[PDB]
């Protein structure tokens, strides 16, 4: 009855004085907007239907038109920013928040979904959803003794919507809204559904993507052990956000970085730094770089966990972007490490793969590598082993490459190049 209607027909039904006719047309609209090939969102908007759909959200007496309108508006709100704006401009936000209390679960869920699309547009709509008071009713839907009694699809939708309220920067979500949400997020991070876990980790990754104070809010809730556990999961959709969150945390203070180390994170990096997904390797190497930028005792834990050989590994062979992250990890290690730690790094074979990367067509990695050489030489100066290092560099083809670089466009390159040749060679 309600399949493949024209917009013209939907409009005629919706403008009828007949609630049942309006219901059939709203369902027809929903089915249009639910089609996979190019749903006519803009024709629906141009027909002036959004205000009608929004008014139908408020018809408590007619639950089916509430649902059909909810779903229609959800699909419009899933499109461009402009499409989402049209839904918001129609007054949908408060009307969807009212529907969170619906006795009908399918309607409540639709309202959750719609608010998730609205908040996911960006900071401004996210913050407007929050101002209209969405968070209390959302969290009330998860206030049960055991999350396992909720329907799977419902809990997944709620988690996804909450993650969108945690998302975006410039600005980041209000501190009080983050404090309000975090306890429910901690609970979802212990739920056993892979999709709930993935979206919970994504939420934590967003909340840790910022200054130390934002990181502290999360770290203080004691989630880092659970994040490290999830970092060891089989499901890539869990590992990806868990590793991003862990990586975000170690961009903070040395004491925040230590909580990740204390939680056992470094024991997973052998796998992460050899992971077949390029992105996991990249992000794991980035994470390592901000751990090697830490304290000497923190560098020592990297050493004890057997991870220097894995950094030599990624430097020797990886996607280029991973190799650049590894070069950073080495410069940081050499910058902050004791002489013994820097010696160990050479003993593990760092020199040849570093020198092979000086052939790269990237100015930044060259500068990074040259800084690392300088730091290593400085440790050799303190041991009076500058010559053995010079010979090592020379034997693997390094001296050739550094010489060339004395004649490179970038100034800091040729400078650092020249200094090395003239001081050690």
Q: Which of residues 148-207 bind other proteins (CB under 8 A)?
A: 160, 164, 167
Our CB check for other proteins shows the closer of 10 and 73 to be: 73
- Choose one: 8-16, 29-37, 351-359, 409-417; the region binding other proteins (CB under 8 A): 29-37
Site string for other proteins, 309-328 (x = CB under 8 A): -------------------x
Candidate residues 137, 252, 313, 353; the one interacting with other proteins per rule CB under 8 A: 252
Q: Which two tokens stand for residue 60?
A: 């408590």
The footprint of other proteins on this chain (CB under 8 A) covers a number of residues equal to 37
Burial of 232 (0-12, 13-18, 19+ CB in 10 A): middle
90 counts as binding other proteins under rule CB under 8 A: no
209 counts as binding other proteins under rule CB under 8 A: yes
Give CA–CA dist 181/201, Å, rounded. 14
- Choose one: 105-113, 269-277, 384-392, 414-422; the region binding other proteins (CB under 8 A): 105-113
Candidate residues 184, 248, 323, 341; the one interacting with other proteins per rule CB under 8 A: 248
Distance of closest approach, residue 324 Cβ to other proteins, in angstroms: 11
Candidate residues 5, 71, 269, 310; the one interacting with other proteins per rule CB under 8 A: 71
Site string for other proteins, 265-304 (x = CB under 8 A): ---------------------x--xx-xxx----------
74 counts as binding other proteins under rule CB under 8 A: yes
- Choose one: 71-79, 267-275, 353-361, 407-415; the region binding other proteins (CB under 8 A): 71-79
Distance of closest approach, residue 353 Cβ to other proteins, in angstroms: 21
Distance of closest approach, residue 339 Cβ to other proteins, in angstroms: 15
Distance of closest approach, residue 297 Cβ to other proteins, in angstroms: 13
- Choose one: 2-10, 12-20, 117-125, 305-313; the region binding other proteins (CB under 8 A): 117-125
Our CB check for other proteins shows the closer of 273 and 402 to be: 273
Q: Which residues bind other proteins (CB under 8 A)?
A: 33-34, 36, 39, 71, 74-75, 77-79, 84, 106, 110, 113, 116-117, 120-121, 160, 164, 167, 209, 247-248, 250-252, 286, 289-290, 292-294, 328, 332, 335-336
């Amino acid at each position: 009855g309600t399949v493949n209607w024209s917009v013209e027909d939907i409009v005629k039904g919706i403008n009828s004085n007949n609630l049942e006719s309006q219901l059939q047309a709203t369902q027809a609209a929903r089915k249009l907007l639910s089609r996979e090939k190019q749903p006519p969102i803009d024709n629906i908007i141009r027909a002036g239907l959004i205000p009608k759909f929004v008014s139908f959200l408020g018809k408590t007496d007619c639950s089916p038109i509430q649902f059909e309108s909810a779903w229609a508006l959800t699909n419009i709100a899933s499109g461009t920013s402009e499409q989402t704006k049209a839904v918001v401009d129609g007054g949908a936000i408060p009307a969807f928040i009212s529907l969170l209390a619906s006795p009908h679960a399918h309607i409540s869920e639709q309202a959750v979904w719609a608010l998730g699309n609205i908040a996911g547009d960006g900071s401004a709509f996210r913050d407007l959803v929050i101002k209209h008071g969405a968070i209390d009713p959302l969290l009330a839907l998860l206030a049960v003794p055991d999350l396992s009694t909720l329907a799977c699809g419902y809990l997944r939708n709620l988690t996804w919507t909450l993650s969108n309220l945690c998302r975006n920067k410039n600005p980041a979500p209000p501190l009080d809204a983050v404090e309000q949400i975090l306890p429910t997020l901690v609970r979802l991070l212990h739920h056993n559904d892979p999709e709930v876990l993935a979206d919970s980790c994504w939420a934590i990754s967003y909340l840790t993507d910022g200054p130390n104070e934002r990181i502290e809010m999360v770290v203080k809730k004691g989630v880092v052990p659970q994040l490290v556990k999830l970092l060891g999961a089989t499901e890539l959709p869990i590992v990806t956000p868990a590793l991003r969150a862990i990586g975000n945390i170690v961009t903070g203070t040395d004491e925040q970085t230590q909580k990740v180390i204390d939680a056992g994170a470094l024991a997973v990096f052998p796998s992460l730094l050899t992971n077949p997904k390029t992105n996991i390797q990249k992000e794991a190497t980035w994470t390592m770089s901000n751990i090697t930028a830490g304290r000497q005792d923190q560098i020592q834990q990297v050493v004890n966990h057997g991870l220097v050989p894995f950094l030599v590994g990624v430097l020797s062979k990886a996607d280029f972007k991973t190799q650049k992250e590894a070069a950073w990890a080495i410069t940081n290690y050499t910058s902050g490490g004791t002489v013994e730690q820097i010696v160990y790094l050479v003993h593990c074979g760092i020199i040849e793969p570093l020198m092979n990367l000086l052939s790269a067509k990237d100015t930044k990695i060259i500068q990074v590598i040259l800084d690392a050489i300088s730091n290593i030489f400085q440790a050799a100066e303190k041991l009076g082993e500058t010559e053995k290092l010079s010979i090592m560099i020379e034997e693997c083809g390094g001296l050739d490459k550094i010489e060339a670089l004395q004649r490179h466009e970038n100034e800091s390159v040729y400078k650092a190049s020249l200094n090395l040749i003239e001081k050690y060679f």
